[PDB]
Amino acid sequence: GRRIQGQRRGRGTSTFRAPSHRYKADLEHRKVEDGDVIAGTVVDIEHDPARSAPVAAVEFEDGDRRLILAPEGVGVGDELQVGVDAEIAPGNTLPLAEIPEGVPVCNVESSPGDGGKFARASGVNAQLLTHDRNVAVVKLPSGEMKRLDPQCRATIGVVGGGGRTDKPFVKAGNKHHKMKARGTKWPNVRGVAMNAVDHPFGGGGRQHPGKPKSISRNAPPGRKVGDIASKRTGRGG
RNA sequence: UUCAAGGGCGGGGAGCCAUGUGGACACGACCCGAAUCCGGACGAUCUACGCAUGGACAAGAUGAAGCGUGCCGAAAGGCACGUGGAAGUCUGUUAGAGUUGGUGUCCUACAAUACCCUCUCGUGAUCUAUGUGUAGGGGUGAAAGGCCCAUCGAGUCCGGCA
RNA sequence: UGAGGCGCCCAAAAUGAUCGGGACUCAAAUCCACCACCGAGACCUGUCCGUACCACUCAUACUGGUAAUCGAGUAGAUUGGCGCUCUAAUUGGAUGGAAGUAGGGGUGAAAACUCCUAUGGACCGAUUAGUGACGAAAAUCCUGGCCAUAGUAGCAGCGAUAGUCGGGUGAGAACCCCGACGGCCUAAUGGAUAAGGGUUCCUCAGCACUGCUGAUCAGCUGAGGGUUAGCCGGUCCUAAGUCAUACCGCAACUCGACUAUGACGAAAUGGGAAACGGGUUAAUAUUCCCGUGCCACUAUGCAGUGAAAGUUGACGCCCUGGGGUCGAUCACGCUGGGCAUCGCCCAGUCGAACCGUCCAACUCCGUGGAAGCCGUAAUGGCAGGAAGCGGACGAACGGCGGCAUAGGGAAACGUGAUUCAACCUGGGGCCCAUGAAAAGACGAGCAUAGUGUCCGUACCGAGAACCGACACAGGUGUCCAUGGCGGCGAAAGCCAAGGCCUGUCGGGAGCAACCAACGUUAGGGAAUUCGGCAAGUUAGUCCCGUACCUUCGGAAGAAGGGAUGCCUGCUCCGGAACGGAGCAGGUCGCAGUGACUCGGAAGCUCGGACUGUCUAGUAACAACAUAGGUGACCGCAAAUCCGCAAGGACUCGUACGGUCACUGAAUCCUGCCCAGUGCAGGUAUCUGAACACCUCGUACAAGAGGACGAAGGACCUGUCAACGGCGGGGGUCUUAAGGUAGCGUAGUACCUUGCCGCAUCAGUAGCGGCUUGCAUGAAUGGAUUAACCAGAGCUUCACUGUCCCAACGUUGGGCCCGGUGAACUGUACAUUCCAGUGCGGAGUCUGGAGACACCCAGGGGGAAGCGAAGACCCUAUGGAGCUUUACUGCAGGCUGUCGCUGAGGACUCUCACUCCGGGAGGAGGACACCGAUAGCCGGGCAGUUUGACUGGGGCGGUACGCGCUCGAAAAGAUAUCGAGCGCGCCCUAUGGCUAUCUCAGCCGGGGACCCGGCGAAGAGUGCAAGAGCAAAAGAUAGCUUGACAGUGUUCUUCCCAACGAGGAACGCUGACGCGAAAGCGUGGUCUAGCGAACCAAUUAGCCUGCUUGAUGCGGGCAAUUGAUGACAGAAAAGCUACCCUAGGGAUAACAGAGUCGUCACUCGCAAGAGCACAUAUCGACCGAGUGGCUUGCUACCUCGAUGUCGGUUCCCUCCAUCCUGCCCGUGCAGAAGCGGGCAAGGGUGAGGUUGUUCGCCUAUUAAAGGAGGUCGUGAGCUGGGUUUAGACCGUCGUGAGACAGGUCGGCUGCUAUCUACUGGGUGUGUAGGUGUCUGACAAGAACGACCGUAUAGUACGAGAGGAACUACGGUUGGUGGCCACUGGUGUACCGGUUGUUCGAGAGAGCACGUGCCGGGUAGCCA
RNA sequence: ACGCGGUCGAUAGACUCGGGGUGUGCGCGUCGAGGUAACGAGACGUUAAGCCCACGAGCACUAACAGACCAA
Ligand SMILES: CSC[S@](=O)C[C@H](CO)NC(=O)/C=C/c1c(C)[nH]c(=O)[nH]c1=O
Ligand SMILES: *C(=O)[C@H](Cc1ccccc1)NC(=O)CCCCCN
Ligand SMILES: [Cl-]
Ligand SMILES: [Cl-]
Ligand SMILES: [Cl-]
Ligand SMILES: [Cl-]
Ligand SMILES: [K+]
Ligand SMILES: [Mg+2]
Ligand SMILES: [Mg+2]
Ligand SMILES: [Mg+2]
Ligand SMILES: [Mg+2]
Ligand SMILES: [Mg+2]
Ligand SMILES: [Mg+2]
Ligand SMILES: [Mg+2]
Ligand SMILES: [Mg+2]
Ligand SMILES: [Mg+2]
Ligand SMILES: [Mg+2]
Ligand SMILES: [Mg+2]
Ligand SMILES: [Mg+2]
Ligand SMILES: [Mg+2]
Ligand SMILES: [Mg+2]
Ligand SMILES: [Mg+2]
Ligand SMILES: [Mg+2]
Ligand SMILES: [Mg+2]
Ligand SMILES: [Mg+2]
Ligand SMILES: [Mg+2]
Ligand SMILES: [Mg+2]
Ligand SMILES: [Mg+2]
Ligand SMILES: [Mg+2]
Ligand SMILES: [Mg+2]
Ligand SMILES: [Mg+2]
Ligand SMILES: [Mg+2]
């Protein structure tokens, strides 16, 4: 047959690419020689086309002007600080070690200095639970308990824009406009509505999948469709 | 070969070469005849989808939130009138897009998809120009096996190839 | 009373009867005899030829002879010869005329040779030996040429119907030019342009080409000429993105991703330093000229030290205020024009860039001091300081002044106003959407001077300059959206400016038939049809009023009712409008949204929630999408995906993420099942590869085995919003469960038109209820649902030419004429018709009939008409796309091992290596990555296979290898999906031999046993069937292993007649068994019980392996065992409705043909009943037939195609008669019937469900008969069904996909050559004329039928009831004609009136070929 | 193709009658709700008016002229 849609994706053609050229900034923690002295002033609050969430423009003492992954509650004028000795208030960034356990955090680094990887979407947050001289245990929004180097920097507070998911799109048109701001092919045609040549679920006098939908982890691309390595399906039990 | 016996093959000198010709086998193999398969190339001037930069949508209808005033109320708020002007909202041959019926006209056509009447959409998932990207078991596809220059259940060109 | 001969009855078929025809009757029939004739290529006979043979001969050269016993022939074998090219030898011809060609003479059986005449004007042969791109009627053959077609189709159809009269030029004028008159185009048919074209632009000269006719014209032909820029574009900048170099990959590159650098990337339409006005040319123009202005750079000079921070460039969608120019309009004045019953109507009234100046809005400052005020269209503002007041900053393509005793105008060369595009400047709202960048400019003065190069510039920009082969009705972007009336309007209609008469052939006929578009049709009003398809109705605006249902939004313009003009005078809102809303009075018409513009309405049911998407070119839908619901994977060095690699998408992203799937808004819900399959987790034990390790083996090695054991599997568990499942039986079984809520004859229900009800005269429809559901059912989602819909079905009102039933009219064709001028098609012949025959579907054969030739128009019956090597079906050891637990492999994922790889069955470390960090350093770490390999998964991908037979193929079956009886025709051989039935073993004895013996069955004496008798064979002999066997081939007993090794002969397998394995018969050699011995034993009494090569294992001996010896391990001679049952041996599944090719009528579907079991009808016999009575009537059994309508069979005809069902329309026919006429019987009183006979003249109708044929149903009726014509009729129509591609449901399948199951949607080509007929002409024949006739023959249905009255309340009859002959009146159907009457038309005509234009008036044009409305003559019509 | 007439003529046209179709012309006069006036839809009269006719009659005014040909 023909390569299935999931395979066209990888080639990275226009249709599957994100409108990068239309994006604003790659949100990452600033680099500080040391000392922490680094502080700056919120100059404005903008909309981030890549995350459908607000972002804060900040002017730093040493002249640097960069957009920042804004937590909820940051306003123009506020003074943010980044470093080991940063005060402990929302919007400030400092290593997990210097952060008091029990405090909600966002934009957490996977490894010290990577600029933040975890908890960055609308209204989410990580939860610093345990400290140590060797391991900082954080609970990520997925519920998992992650062990991190206490040297990993983070931002205090939860990400701005919480509750975005609460309102339904209501109409195809709204999805449309959102989708146009992401690296995604939309709308979605069901495999079972295709021809046998286009998808392992395609074909038939009526619409139904050919075999069972749970596919092995070892299935090859072109065949790995449906419920991938499902440990279970349905809702019962 | 065989204890033995019995069988198999061969044996009392005709071949070799040349020329014509009959026939066999491989090769295009008397000649034409078809749907393939494979290789390397050429195409997104059509069209599909995405991107960049521009452009387009008479007029009318309905009257969401919000806000105002007045009345009622302890309050909560409620009621009336106005204001406001929302909507993949309505009417609409505005422009523009689409293509339901007539199974009309045409059917050596005006035309290798046309004409007329009728009909759908017409502020949006809208229409459109130009630029630009994706290439052949690959694209592209709101999925019809649709579309990729009158060519698609695997484009076109030449070659493999007689 | 028996028999015979001939005939008669029995006896019905579709265009015109038949014996070939005529026709025949003491025969021209039939039978018995007879006589004479005709009649083949046979037979006889003369001559000749060929072939074979004989004699003679070198000869196959002659000559002679023989053939009663020689003379046909497709495929094929054999043999002699003719012609062509060029070579060679030998030898000839030709300018006193070669070859070739045309016509003609002679020879040869013939291929072919030769001559003569003419033409031609330079080459040409013969013999012999060679040579070969050597011979054509054919291939839907190739190329070229040519005829018919035919002076035919087209040059008409499009909402753009366009011309006419004069004149000019010219050889020539319908279409070239001038004038007038008349028209066409208004977002275009006007003006400016992008792309694209490329000289098409202008001038002159032309007409051979092109131009749908002509041409003096031209986008044509030829020759000249034409495009002028500091301030318009390009150029410069950067966008999506592209390239180049470097780096790295790759076997390699012209290949490839990333990262650097550089460059490229916008001419209408991104950003951007600067130009305006006038004039000028045949053709350019913000470019030239005149005038005026401006920008940038540089130089000089004065000023200035400022100078880079900032601003700008620079930005989305929706609503809106303010400023404001042009335009348009209004008022008044001036200038010019038009009109002439008034006094109106039209045009103009001008004047730039630029320089200077003014400034609303926004923002801000001071003052002020609001506790309720300020303000808006709206939101809003304020003690954090409202209003007011004063001030800073600050806009237009705008005002104002200059520019300008510039320019322009014949002149005047105005002033105000409203509404205000452009342009300027604000306020508000929206986002799960956030709406470029860079160059540049500003910031940052002024004088003077110099410089400002390079490229583009013509023209078209489209119903003739672009793309579409064309001067193509198609396609093709931007700006002018402000010209007038109109009105909501960028709408219609009408009209300016501007353009055009080139959507480029004309002339003629009241102009017929027929066709395209269209108008109007009385009465009826969907009766039409699959269906209201098509058409029609309704319509604008205001007032009143508005149901069920509902997601409260909607439904809704529901429905329904009323109003609507003009004129006079007014009121209200507002600053006002040349804006809007009303009032009073007057008044005209059939009609006041008067044209135009402009909804028909209501209800029930099905589907999908909605807007949206789709099969460019037969499917717009219920299909796709969607929000919403749900499950799955993943913590980012991720999940998923692309790449060979280097690398990459997702990702400027981070679980409120994004990937992979299912369902498909809302509402109420979503039961049971984990056995199979899938996925996932676990796992004592079992299984599980390679490396390393251990054992054996080998001086090593191959090799065999062990130990250990990863993923995986077994096993266990979880999981169904995972594939999917939810039955039979009883008051459990398969296989886990055993169908819950709902829904239900469904778009799912076979039976089926289910039953009941609604509705209708009548309802296979529709809706409601019931419902056992062939075969409903829960995210394979169930139910239900407001709103929405070019989605499917149904009902009502309204409407109407859909119909009854057609008519008249309008326009363009058609017809005739001038000009232009194709194509399809053509084996030949052809004036046919009826029958027959023939490969069974004939213009051509056979017999008859008819037929004088040619031509014009027509509608298409036939040429199984033209078009297309059938797309259905089968066949081919064809193709492709698709599927899967088909075969075989290949990617990819998981896992063990080795290398990178290091230190001290679990562990630490650091140094490689990887990742994070700018670095320091941090994390990880001998793992991971990468290279190599092993095991598991692995339709993600590739190549293939998936057999044959067959009353087509499939399904079923195996007649696919074997044995027997019969078929099989008394030798042998012999077919079918022929009839009966068997074999794929079993046996150590059930083999072999010898001895002894005789069996079944019956009888008699003491079903065991014993005795006697009869007893040729019926017993027994392993197993089919047939055969054999009695001192045995059987039984009993004993002994034995011949069921032995080796090797043959022969038969069979395979008749004849080649072919292997296998089998058998009969020998020999050797060794044995038993017997006294002869002898028997080559397995079972005979015919079934079987298997190649390659490879392996096995048996005994021997041969052999590369210079040589030893060892190991190989190679071989002979043979046994292991299987190919498709059995003379491949290793092997399906779908295609997306399909494709080669073919086949070798083979199916419709139709034809044959048959006639079936079907229809009849006859013979007549049991029987019919109160008695076979035969008034009904009529079994059985028997004999006829038809060719049904159904089946067959496979003859057609697969280089004979278009399907039904319907429709139009024609002919049959009779087995439904009605009508004439009759017979009756269980015939009458009336009404029942049955039968003759009879085909005429009639046999309208409707409701259904695509139906058929059939059911209703009301009428004299009756509402059946059948044939290719199941008549698609070069006639329709297209509802069947039967393509889309989609759904149920069932089946793992799946692709399947299902005379259902369902929605789904195309109808062609110009008539011949023939046929309907009508019209021209000629010839009879043989100059006028007029009038005749009548061989031909056609008719020209008439069919019914009702009523008198007869008559009569005959008959108890009565009830109730005729007839005859005479009358009328109706219906059909037929022919006609228009006084009624009616239709009547784009003749006359009137009314709306909009607009001509100034009003008068009088007119347009509004589609009448604007609309009202009336309507003639004619034509019903 | 057919039929009729052709000056010894009524065949076609013009004109005038007759017979028909519409429905009362232009202009002028009077009235007219009103309005200072300007103006004024419309009513009545003149007016069975005006306009029109594919038919008939009268009527030689116009045109059926001129003339060609075939023919035993
Ligand atoms: C020869 S072309 C005419 S078609 O063959 C006509 C005939 C009957 O007249 N129709 C059929 O044979 C139809 C058969 C069908 C079959 C076998 N199966 C189906 O599913 N549908 C059918 O129509
Ligand atoms: C069945 O009768 C087939 C159906 C079909 C076949 C192919 C494509 C679509 C439908 N019909 C035919 O075979 C008709 C054949 C016409 C032959 C005419 N000469
Ligand atoms: Cl989303
Ligand atoms: Cl010869
Ligand atoms: Cl330009
Ligand atoms: Cl405002
Ligand atoms: K056929
Ligand atoms: Mg980033
Ligand atoms: Mg919304
Ligand atoms: Mg996208
Ligand atoms: Mg979908
Ligand atoms: Mg599909
Ligand atoms: Mg597949
Ligand atoms: Mg479904
Ligand atoms: Mg499904
Ligand atoms: Mg393009
Ligand atoms: Mg309002
Ligand atoms: Mg809309
Ligand atoms: Mg609309
Ligand atoms: Mg399909
Ligand atoms: Mg012969
Ligand atoms: Mg010689
Ligand atoms: Mg031949
Ligand atoms: Mg013809
Ligand atoms: Mg048109
Ligand atoms: Mg016209
Ligand atoms: Mg010219
Ligand atoms: Mg000229
Ligand atoms: Mg550039
Ligand atoms: Mg530009
Ligand atoms: Mg010009
Ligand atoms: Mg120009």
Ligand SMILES: [Mg+2]
């Ligand atoms: Mg043209």
Ligand SMILES: [Mg+2]
């Ligand atoms: Mg009518």
Ligand SMILES: [Mg+2]
């Ligand atoms: Mg009907």
Ligand SMILES: [Mg+2]
């Ligand atoms: Mg009917």
Ligand SMILES: [Mg+2]
């Ligand atoms: Mg219709």
Ligand SMILES: [Mg+2]
């Ligand atoms: Mg007022």
Ligand SMILES: [Mg+2]
């Ligand atoms: Mg239904």
Ligand SMILES: [Mg+2]
């Ligand atoms: Mg829909």
Ligand SMILES: [Mg+2]
């Ligand atoms: Mg289509």
Ligand SMILES: [Mg+2]
């Ligand atoms: Mg549609």
Ligand SMILES: [Mg+2]
């Ligand atoms: Mg369509």
Ligand SMILES: [Mg+2]
């Ligand atoms: Mg759907």
Ligand SMILES: [Mg+2]
């Ligand atoms: Mg979803």
Ligand SMILES: [Mg+2]
């Ligand atoms: Mg029902």
Ligand SMILES: [Mg+2]
């Ligand atoms: Mg369920």
Ligand SMILES: [Mg+2]
């Ligand atoms: Mg064929």
